[PDB]
């Protein structure tokens, strides 16, 4: 089998992607943020704080002809950005891009923070990295694509994402159109949970490739790159005005600027994000003050290869036995 959706910006920076999701008998459709950084697939519900909820749509697995709860199962989880969500468990059918899994763990929000409620066109998140980082207890679940992995042509999935337009993930194919030249695979370490694995290097602009190793991860669900604070040092070093600001929260600099591109290596070869992609618009309407895409990863614990970077490239997440990641220009 294979699946294929669409992904869609939720605002004109890119935030972050939503992919429509099909969830239970007959179906109901909600839109989720597929993140390669966690593993749990939870979902705006019946069952969240009324008070949480401010125009997501919500699952009923009530409604649901094939929802069973799972009993005594329940999940909590914290992301990176501080936000946090928590609740129960049904099993359902799921389906994605026409690619279909039966007996799926749908976590349902009981509560959300306050950030996931201000976000009314996310109904919750496909998670996507290895299931040994999903939170529901006594029974750790395993992901939709552990799920779809055996009955997939190919136990893969690629994630194209577009510059302020839609783009695609698909499950069980490379789709050799998608991409230009060949693509370069690189090795991953499952230790953490992540999609982790580490760049050969970078350049700034037109500048000289340094080589240098960068462990990482590649995450959808996180916006920008965020790497260590020499390289983010070098990058914003080229834009004139550029610094850092304590009481932004990171690198800004002048909305006049015309900002380079930057590269980062993968084995021997090389991704190119233009320098539009490291633009996220003024701090707050009508600043000439802009916020940077490259971001230091310092007090994070890890560098990640957010949508900035991923979406510079065509990107295929290999589970085989042996996990791989590559990476082919578009």
């Not at 099993?91 to 799921?94: A, L, Q």
């Given at each position: 089998?294979?699946?294929?959706?669409?992904?869609?910006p939720?605002?004109?920076?890119?935030?972050?992607?939503?992919?429509?999701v099909?969830?239970?008998t007959?179906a109901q459709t909600l839109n989720?943020?597929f993140d390669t950084?966690?593993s749990?697939?939870?979902?705006?519900?019946?069952?969240?704080?009324?008070?949480?909820?401010?125009?997501?749509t919500?699952?009923?697995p009530?409604?649901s002809t094939?929802?069973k709860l799972?009993?005594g199962?329940?999940?909590?989880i914290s992301?990176?950005?501080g936000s946090?969500?928590?609740?129960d468990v049904y099993?359902?059918?799921?389906s994605?891009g026409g690619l279909?899994?039966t007996?799926?763990?749908?976590?349902?929000?009981?509560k959300?923070?306050?950030?996931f409620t201000?976000?009314s066109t996310?109904?919750?998140l496909?998670?996507?990295?290895?299931?040994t980082?999903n939170?529901?207890?006594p029974?750790q679940?395993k992901?939709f694509?552990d799920?779809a992995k055996a009955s997939?042509?190919?136990?893969?999935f690629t994630?194209?994402?577009?510059?302020?337009?839609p783009?695609?993930?698909n499950?069980?194919?490379?789709?050799?159109?998608?991409?230009?030249?060949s693509?370069?695979y690189?090795?991953?370490?499952?230790?953490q949970?992540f999609?982790?694995?580490?760049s050969?290097?970078?350049?700034?602009?037109?500048?000289?490739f340094k080589?240098?190793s960068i462990?990482?991860?590649?995450?959808t669900?996180?916006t920008?790159?965020?790497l260590?604070?020499?390289?983010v040092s070098?990058?914003?070093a080229?834009?004139?005005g550029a610094?850092?600001s304590?009481?932004?929260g990171?690198?800004?600099?002048?909305c006049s600027?015309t900002?380079?591109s930057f590269?980062?290596?993968?084995?021997?070869?090389r991704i190119?994000?233009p320098g539009?992609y490291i633009?996220?618009?003024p701090?707050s309407t009508?600043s000439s003050?802009c916020?940077?895409?490259?971001?230091?990863?310092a007090?994070?614990?890890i560098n990640?290869?957010?949508?900035?970077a991923l979406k510079?490239?065509?990107?295929?997440?290999?589970?085989?036995?042996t996990?791989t990641?590559?990476?082919?220009?578009?």
């Open positions: 089998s294979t699946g294929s959706a669409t992904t869609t939720i605002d004109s920076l890119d935030d972050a992607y939503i992919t429509p099909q969830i239970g007959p989720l943020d950084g966690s749990d697939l939870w979902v705006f519900s019946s069952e969240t704080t009324a008070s949480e909820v401010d125009g997501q919500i699952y009923t009530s409604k094939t929802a799972l009993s199962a329940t999940w909590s992301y990176g950005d946090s969500s928590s609740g099993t359902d059918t799921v994605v279909t899994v007996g799926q763990a749908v976590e349902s929000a009981k959300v923070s306050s950030s201000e976000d996310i109904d919750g496909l998670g996507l990295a290895f299931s980082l939170t529901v207890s029974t679940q992901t694509f799920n997939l042509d190919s136990p893969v994630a194209d994402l577009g510059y302020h337009a783009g695609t993930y499950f069980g194919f490379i789709d050799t159109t998608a991409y230009t030249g693509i370069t690189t090795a991953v370490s499952t230790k949970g999609w982790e694995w580490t050969t290097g970078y350049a700034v602009g037109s500048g000289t080589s240098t462990d990482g991860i590649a995450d669900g996180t920008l790159l965020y260590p604070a020499t390289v070098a990058y914003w080229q834009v004139s610094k850092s304590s009481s932004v990171g690198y800004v600099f002048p600027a900002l380079p590269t980062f290596g993968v084995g021997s070869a190119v994000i539009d633009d996220f618009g701090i009508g003050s916020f940077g895409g490259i971001q230091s990863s007090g994070i614990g990640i290869f957010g949508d900035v510079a490239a065509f990107v295929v997440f290999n589970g085989a036995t996990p990641l590559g990476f082919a220009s578009k």
